Amino acid sequence: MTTNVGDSTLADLLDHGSGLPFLVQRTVARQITLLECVGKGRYGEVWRGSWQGENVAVKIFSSRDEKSWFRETELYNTVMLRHENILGFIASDMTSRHSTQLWLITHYHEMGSLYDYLQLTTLDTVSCLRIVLSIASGLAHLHIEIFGTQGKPAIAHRDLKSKNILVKKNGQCCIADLGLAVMHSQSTNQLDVGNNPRVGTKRYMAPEVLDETIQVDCFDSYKRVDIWAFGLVLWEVARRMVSNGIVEDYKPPFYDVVPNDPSFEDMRKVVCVDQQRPNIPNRWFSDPTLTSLAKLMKECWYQNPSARLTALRIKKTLTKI
């Protein structure tokens, strides 16, 4: 074998910020061998890489999205964010050759995003609850503030969607992409919004965002945007659960009323002017699991943001199902 005495795995180097030690981040980054391109978009590219035979995910940002790479790198390096349902951060690096390249290295999840997973596979009661409860547990971990040295401030994602949720090998999910995140500390009540010209996904935008009525100086408003988007993700997942031999094809939220890559006015007319919500199929109430999920979606879609459930309330309900 190619193993020599003193070789360390990634798990050994990570045991120590959320990822590797600072100087170790640069060494591991520039020893990664890119293998296959698994994503490409306005954000940049996502590559499956390899460090010492171990799979890793490498997000190579575009020059227009440098502020998202800054926020996610700053967040992961300053806040201890290690959780089963949050994407595991490994390292962040920048190179001045090939002009500049910005790299974010995370765990690699071969199943891909929840968006891709739901299009190929159907679910049962066990796999649906595992997916849905994991997202709630990761979102609740982000929203709740933990005190102490190993603690974390309250965090809101602000771009939660099935494409930003990865399916792990054990069937659970993890939340990714913290470039639009905001922070809040209860000790000083300060809100950290950041500096990023990136806008959220319009299809998942909450009503208070589309009519510009959201209270931008209140951290609770950003958490309730996540709950709205989470409810739409619940609607995507529950469609793929089989009950009585019936299942729905995968469809994005509002597939039947807006086109692909919708505009602000497309969403504002559907969500705000017409007050439309995704339709709940009637066959779901013949199944106790989808009945509980249907009840949770409607409680994420209240026009009044304060009426929506909390991420912690959703996890407790899913734990009892």
């Binding site: 003193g6 120590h16 030690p21 600072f22 100087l23 170790v24 640069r26 060494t27 520039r30 020893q31």
Partner: peptide, 20 residues
């Protein structure tokens, strides 16, 4: 901001590979 001594784990890098 960083110390290999605090974790009692030596740090290795290859000279000339621009790893530091």
């Amino acid at each position: 901001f960083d110390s290999s001594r605090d974790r009692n784990k030596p740090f290795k890098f290859m000279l000339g590979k621009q790893e530091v």
